[PDB]
Design a protein around this ligand. Structure first.
Ligand SMILES: [Ca+2]
Lengths: 549, 235
């Protein structure tokens, strides 16, 4: 539901292409994704797929593919009404169904309303009913699109399945000859001129969608000149407008730079170096690069004994990677704790101050603070930080500063004030000698509850991992035409805790209940087999059914 | 034999068949993940409280199932075979009910039933579509209303563009700028006087909290304030 990818075409070493995918849906027990190989009836695939969808969201067929979350505006809200269940569209037109909910140890009823724009989310009686997805009516087709693309053996046969995929999803392409591609897929609405997509529109007639934008408009690239295609839920393409989610922004501050900077530090990549990026990005502090110039020059005039400079010198001597100590409960460097403090104080003085309470709670987060069991998904630059970053840029930002976030004061003054806050709160917690600071390392968990918050295992089955890693729920890599070896394609992945979720009534766990769980933690990986020899040579069991019809 | 269909490696199954292939798939899944898959089926359809009692979350029932029913009904016979076969595969592994093979979790939680093509479809639609491709907070109008009550109509809307910008040309893009995106009413809207994002809460273990409506709102607020889009109340 976020997640990352880097396809490598000119940029591969000892191979023709390397696709490394790392979808981030959170970490669960049993594993979110499911390994499967399908052979016959047109298919010839191996990979792993969320919730065992018939279609393999991540795999290869001897071309490879993957997905990240697109985050395009494919959903708009129509503001429809004291003639109940009717709405005006110069005439009084609702569809309703009745739903009763059975309850185990309790009592059973409500109605759901649909307009010609869609389901009614909310009725504000003091004024209006709000109800529209560009992909409505194409859900199953989107499923069968993800299935049929598995049979594709070239760019055209692939893209014509991409264009039947109606949800906002980045798809990716690589093939045996070193060709790579990208299609920000999805149905999108052809809006009226004047339609602001960030806010509802009236649903009285004049603002209805004209229909769907053409697939010609869906962002695409094939064999780009950079020799790669990187993404971490960032803008597909110039002038491409994001989803309307208030907490979501595509600005100058973006974590995908952390990928891009790595993929430009050297001319080519082996399949090993490509996989090694999961490690690098995993432990990478995402805010140091953004705010360190500003901190560096806000404290340039201070003396060394000044705590506010001391903090910044500590950040200045840091490579921006977090490694947890052998005790398994602390980081080697206090950098993130420092930036978390400062950033929290800064947002409280700028973005939050400028927003009327209680909406300042939307922009308070420094993007670090988390509960004991560790982060629920990936880590990102927060919406507050991003806005702040545009303000720190000033006239270098294309964004018009309607309200000054610095309240008439110079940047350096607010920056220094937040450092003083940071120092007060951090010197209280870990004491007055910075070189002794043992700041809490972030942990990771494989929660026994699915993303809905509904249990999919016993509370006991939750698994722990000392080091949180900012990486895919699973990671898969495909390498095409490797110079060494007899195989045209080499694939790897890792489905932690393991392939099975089975526990027998006597409480005996399956052999493969837990055998990838240490593999995940160490950035290891198992091989994916495609060919009938490779499969048979590594068989552990073999069953044959007769199915009638 | 034409009617013949499984080999396993770290436990990963490979299916061999010569046509309705997805039966094999359905089968191996019901062996490996029968409980997880049953609780995805209940989650995507809002039937969780039928077995779990705090989850009346169920009121998911954010979609129109008759639409999805009708989509399935108009499929080609071959497309339909995927869904039909996966379901029948799952159902065959009847064997659990004949020799309760029953995952411990069913016993612990106190209730499996057969599947249909709808259920299978619904696993995708409940997750990829109704959850992940459905991201809106147009919460935005409530922010706008409050922004205007503090700065005035004009300056409010200018501050709204500073916080939720429509486009930003300095943003890193996967497709390098050297193609671009060729496609280059707020004052008609009523006021929005609590933001819906507050009526969505989960605890640290990821479980739903069963708070009161007031309390839930207070909680959602509190944790979003602390952790944001990447926290327990994030998206
Ligand atoms: Ca919208």
């Amino acid at each position: 539901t976020t997640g990352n990818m880097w396809v490598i075409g000119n940029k591969a070493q000892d191979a023709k292409a390397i696709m490394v995918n790392g979808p981030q849906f959170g970490w669960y027990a049993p594993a979110y994704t499911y390994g499967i190989g399908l052979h016959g009836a047109g298919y010839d695939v191996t990979g792993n797929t969320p919730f065992a969808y018939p279609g393999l969201v991540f795999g290869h067929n001897g071309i490879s593919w993957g997905s990240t979350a697109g985050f395009g505006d494919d959903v708009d809200i129509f503001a429809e009404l004291a003639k109940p269940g009717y709405y005006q569209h110069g005439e009084w037109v609702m569809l309703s169904r009745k739903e009763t909910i059975a309850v185990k140890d309790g009592q059973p009823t409500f109605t759901v309303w649909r307009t010609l724009h869609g389901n009614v989310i909310k009725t504000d009686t003091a004024t209006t009913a709000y109800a529209a997805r560009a992909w409505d009516g194409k859900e199953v087709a989107s499923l069968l699109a993800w299935t049929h693309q598995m049979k594709a053996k070239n760019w055209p046969e692939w893209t014509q399945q991409a264009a039947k995929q109606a949800l906002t999803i980045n798809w990716y392409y690589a093939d045996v000859n070193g060709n790579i591609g990208y299609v920000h897929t999805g149905a999108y609405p052809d809006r009226q001129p004047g339609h602001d997509p960030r806010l509802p529109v009236p649903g009285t007639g004049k603002w209805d969608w004209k229909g769907l934008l053409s697939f010609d408009l869906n962002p695409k690239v094939y064999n780009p000149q950079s020799g790669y295609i990187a993404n971490w839920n960032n803008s597909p393409q110039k002038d491409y407008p994001a989803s309307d989610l208030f907490a979501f922004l595509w600005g100058g501050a973006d974590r995908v730079t952390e990928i891009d900077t790595i993929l430009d530090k050297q001319p080519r990549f082996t399949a090993d170096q490509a996989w090694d990026v999961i490690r690098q990005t995993s432990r990478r502090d995402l805010n140091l690069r953004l705010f360190l110039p500003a901190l560096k020059d806000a404290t340039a005039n201070l003396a060394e004994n000044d705590p506010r400079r001391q903090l910044v010198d500590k950040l200045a001597s840091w490579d921006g990677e977090n490694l947890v100590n052998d005790d398994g409960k602390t980081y080697q460097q206090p950098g993130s704790a420092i930036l978390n403090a400062w950033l929290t104080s800064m947002l409280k003085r700028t973005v939050v101050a400028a927003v009327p309470a209680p909406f300042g709670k939307w922009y308070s987060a420094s993007g670090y603070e988390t509960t004991q069991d560790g982060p629920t998904g990936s880590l990102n630059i927060s919406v507050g930080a991003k806005i702040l970053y545009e303000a720190l840029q000033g006239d270098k930002s294309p964004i018009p500063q309607a309200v000054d976030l610095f309240g008439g004061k110079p940047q350096q003054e607010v920056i220094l004030a937040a450092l003083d806050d940071a120092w007060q709160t951090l010197s209280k917690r870990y004491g007055n000698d910075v070189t002794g600071w043992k700041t809490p390392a972030m942990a990771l968990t494989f929660r026994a509850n699915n993303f809905f918050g509904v249990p999919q295992a016993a509370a006991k089955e939750a698994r722990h991992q000392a080091e949180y890693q900012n990486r895919g729920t699973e990671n898969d890599m495909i390498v095409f035409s490797p110079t060494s070896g007899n195989r045209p394609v080499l694939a790897w992945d890792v489905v932690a805790p393991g392939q099975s979720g089975f526990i027998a009534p006597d409480g005996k766990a399956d052999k493969h209940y837990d055998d990838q769980l240490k593999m995940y933690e160490s950035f290891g990986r198992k091989s994916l087999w495609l060919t009938p020899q490779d499969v048979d040579e590594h068989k552990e069991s073999q069953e044959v059914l007769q199915v009638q019809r | 034999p034409p009617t013949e269909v499984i080999v396993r490696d770290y436990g990963m199954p490979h299916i061999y068949a010569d046509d309705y292939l997805f039966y094999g798939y359905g089968y191996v899944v019901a062996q490996d993940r029968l409980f997880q898959m049953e609780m995805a089926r209940r989650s995507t359809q809002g039937t969780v409280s039928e077995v779990l009692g705090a989850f009346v979350f169920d009121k998911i029932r954010n979609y129109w199932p008759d639409s999805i029913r009708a989509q399935i009904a108009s499929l080609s016979a071959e497309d339909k075979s995927i869904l039909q076969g996966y379901a029948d595969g799952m159902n065959a592994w009847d064997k659990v009910n004949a020799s309760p093979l029953l995952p411990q979790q069913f016993s612990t939680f106190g209730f499996p039933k057969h599947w249909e093509p709808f259920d299978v479809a619904m696993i995708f639609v409940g997750t990829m579509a109704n959850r992940f491709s459905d991201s809106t907070s147009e919460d935005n109008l409530a922010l706008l209303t409050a922004l205007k009550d503090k700065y005035g109509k004009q300056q409010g809307m200018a501050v709204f563009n500073q916080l939720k910008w429509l486009v930003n040309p300095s943003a890193p893009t996967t497709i390098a700028a050297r193609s671009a995106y060729p496609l280059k009413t707020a004052a008609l809207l009523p006021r929005y006087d609590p933001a819906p994002m507050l009526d969505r809460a989960k605890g640290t273990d990821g479980a739903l909290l069963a708070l009161t409506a007031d309390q839930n709102r207070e909680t959602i607020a509190a944790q979003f304030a602390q952790s944001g889009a990447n926290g327990l109340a994030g998206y």
